[PDB]
Amino acid sequence: HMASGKRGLAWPWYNSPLDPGVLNNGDGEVVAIYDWETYAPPTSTGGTGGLGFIGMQGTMDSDSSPVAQLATRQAQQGWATVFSLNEPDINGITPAEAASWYIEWVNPLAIKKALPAVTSSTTSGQGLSWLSEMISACAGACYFDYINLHWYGTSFAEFQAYIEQAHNQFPSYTIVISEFALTNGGNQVAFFESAFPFLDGLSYVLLYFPFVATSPALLQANDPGAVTTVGTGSCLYTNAGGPSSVGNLMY
Ligand SMILES: OC[C@H]1O[C@@H](O[C@@H]2[C@@H](O)[C@H](O[C@@H]3[C@@H](O)[C@H](O)O[C@H](CO)[C@H]3O)O[C@H](CO)[C@H]2O)[C@H](O)[C@@H](O)[C@@H]1O
Ligand SMILES: OC[C@H]1O[C@@H](O[C@@H]2[C@@H](O)[C@H](O)O[C@H](CO)[C@H]2O)[C@H](O)[C@@H](O)[C@@H]1O
Ligand SMILES: [Cl-]
Known part of the structure; x- marks a missing residue:
């Protein structure tokens, strides 16, 4: 609601x-x-x-x-x-x-x-x-509102532990997660299905950005580096520019 x-x-x-x-x-x-x-x-x-x-x-x-x-x-x-x-x-x-x-x-x-x-x-x-x-x-001379985390790993359990550890170690800072996904060879859909409701419940997480809001074709053409480490399972778009199975989780 x-x-x-x-x-x-x-x-x-x-x-x-x-x-x-x-x-x-x-x-x-x-x-x-x-x-x-x-x-x-x-x-x-x-x-x-x-x-x-x-x-x-x-x-x-x-x-x-x-x-x-x-x-x-x-x-x-x-x-x-x-x-x-x-x-x-x-x-x-x-x-x-x-x-x-x-x-x-x-x-x-x-x-x-x-x-x-x-x-x-x-x-x-x-x-x-x-x-x-x-x-x-x-x-004391830096003006900032947020700390900014990346995470790439092999399980939701590892991700949950990392965010809970980051919070436990910086308990007075609001967190932005500007990139996160599994590394290659996992089920990215199942990961984000777990990660979204977890992050949605954390008052100290302001924003999260799944890697990556593009299509597999564009990621392969322009970021071969990301494809070798992450694969194309976490692309939010289809090659036509519609929502992927991960894109559909964003709604
Ligand atoms: O020369 C080609 C093109 O380069 C562009 O600069 C890009 C960065 O925009 C790009 O930014 C992201 C990376 O930081 C991140 O790791 O991955 C994402 C998803 O693939 C990238 O979009 O980083 C690369 C270097 O890795 C730069 O080459 C210029 O902005 C653009 O003007 C220029 O045409
Ligand atoms: O990032 C912390 C806050 O920074 C504010 O800007 C600062 C000014 O208040 C201060 O007078 O000067 C410094 C250095 O020029 C600025 O960074 C923002 O206006 C706030 O939105 C922000 O929470
Ligand atoms: Cl990382």
């Missing part, structure tokens, strides 16, 4: 043929879209199908998301939320380097802000350890 309203589209740059409105039935479960960039989602309509776009400075600077244009693009587009670096914990960016960069470039955006998306790694100096060290390096 009232949607949890936590679901979002992780929307790749190559999605010009696809329509985000296909996965928005107006009920209010799907509310957000991000595209790993600070330019608007490329779509078949030129719109976001009624979804709120979250700008993302996923690199420290790029040709596609120039950090010198970050403040400009927020003002032009009127984001209510911004995401920062994508997986700096496995991209040779020290917590101290991320903290300095975040204070210079993300702090000035007077809207809701997420700390960088970290991987689910527990290997030395990665994942939540990296995040804890970045918050220490921030020395």
Whole structure:
């Protein structure tokens, strides 16, 4: 009788043929879209199908998301939320380097802000350890509202344990899950059938974005890396641009 309203589209740059409105039935479960960039989602309509776009400075600077244009693009587009670096914990960016960069470039955006998306790694100096060290390096000078998690693994049990552990270890922070799926060789439908009602019940999870809101054909053509690690089971769209068996869970 009232949607949890936590679901979002992780929307790749190559999605010009696809329509985000296909996965928005107006009920209010799907509310957000991000595209790993600070330019608007490329779509078949030129719109976001009624979804709120979250700008993302996923690199420290790029040709596609120039950090010198970050403040400009927020003002032009009127984001209510911004995401920062994508997986700096496995991209040779020290917590101290991320903290300095975040204070210079993300702090000035007077809207809701997420700390960088970290991987689910527990290997030395990665994942939540990296995040804890970045918050220490921030020395109280980073303005943020959310922590940002990725998870890829082999069971719902592992995912539930990871989110409960993340909450237990950061009990005063609201969580965005900007990417999650099983790795290749599982049943992605069964995973998301378990994950959605689990996440919908957690007050401390603001948003979750299944990897990935595209078709298998587009993922294979443009992200062979993701296909080798995740497979094509978690694609929300059919190759025609309708909802997949995972897309159908978004409604
Ligand atoms: O040069 C081709 C094209 O590159 C685009 O930049 C892309 C990023 O947009 C892309 O972003 C996502 C990844 O960060 C994430 O890991 O996977 C998703 C789903 O596949 C990606 O969409 O990351 C790649 C590098 O992995 C970049 O090449 C530019 O935005 C675009 O202007 C340009 O035409
Ligand atoms: O992210 C925390 C909050 O940040 C706010 O913007 C900050 C300003 O209040 C403060 O005066 O300056 C800093 C640095 O320029 C800003 O980041 C947002 O307005 C809030 O929405 C947000 O919750
Ligand atoms: Cl991960």
